[PDB]
Write a protein that binds this ligand. Structure first.
Ligand code: GNP
Ligand code: MG
Length: 166
C-alpha cells in the first residue's frame, strides 16, 4: 500500500476543511466542522492501486501555525484552493505557491488548482481565468463543490496522479 502526503492550502473560508471532510468522512459523525488544522486519513483505490492518503487541512496564511514550513517539507502534493465567489482568495493563490516554492525549493512540485463553491451562482472568478492561471503554473485545474460533492474525489485523485507522474 502506497502512502501519499497531501496538503490542502488556501485563503480563510474557501472550503479547505469542507473539502477534506467531504473526502475522508466515514459518516459516523453527522456534522464535522473543524476549527483547527488537523491531519486525516483515507484509504482508497486509485487505478487498481490501494493508496493511503494523509491529508493535512491547513489554516490560511492569515493564521499563525508553527509547523507550516515542516508541513510543506513533508507534503508531497498540494491542493491549492480558492472560492469562485471570492476574487481575493483567487489572487492570494500566488502567495500559497510562492511559499511552497520557497520551502521546497523547487519549480516542479505536484499541485492542483481548485476552484471551490462552484454550486454558487454569484461567481466572480471566471472558469477560463482560473484555467489560464493553472496553465501558467503547468498544473491541472478542477472546480469543486463541497456541498454537492461535485469534483471533490476528482481533485484529490488528480493530485495523487500528479504525484505518481512526478
Ligand atoms: N456554497 C458552498 N459553501 C461552501 C463550500 N465549501 C465550504 N462552504 C462553506 O464556506 C464556509 C467556509 O468553509 P470551511 O470549510 O470552513 O473553509 P476553510 O477554508 O476551512 N476555512 P478556514 O480557513 O477558516 O479554516 C462554511 O460556511 C462552509 O459551509 C462549497 O463548496 N459551497
Ligand atoms: Mg478550515
Amino acid at each position: 500500500m502506497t502512502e501519499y502526503k497531501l496538503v490542502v492550502v488556501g485563503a480563510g473560508g474557501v472550503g479547505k476543511s469542507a473539502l477534506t471532510i467531504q473526502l475522508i468522512q466515514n459518516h459516523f459523525v453527522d456534522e464535522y466542522d473543524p476549527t483547527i488544522e488537523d491531519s486525516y486519513r483515507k484509504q482508497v483505490v486509485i487505478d487498481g492501486e490501494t493508496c493511503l492518503l494523509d491529508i493535512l487541512d491547513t489554516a490560511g496564511l492569515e493564521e499563525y501555525s508553527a509547523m507550516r514550513d515542516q508541513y510543506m517539507r513533508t507534503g508531497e502534493g498540494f491542493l491549492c484552493v480558492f472560492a469562485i465567489n471570492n476574487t481575493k482568495s483567487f489572487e492570494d493563490i500566488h502567495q500559497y505557491r510562492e511559499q511552497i516554492k520557497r520551502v521546497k525549493d523547487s519549480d516542479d512540485v505536484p499541485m492542483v488548482l481548485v476552484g471551490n463553491k462552484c454550486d454558487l451562482a454569484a461567481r466572480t472568478v471566471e472558469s477560463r481565468q482560473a484555467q489560464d492561471l493553472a496553465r501558467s503554473y503547468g498544473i491541472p485545474y478542477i472546480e469543486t463543490s463541497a456541498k454537492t460533492r461535485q469534483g471533490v474525489e476528482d481533485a484529490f485523485y488528480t493530485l495523487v496522479r500528479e504525484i505518481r507522474q512526478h
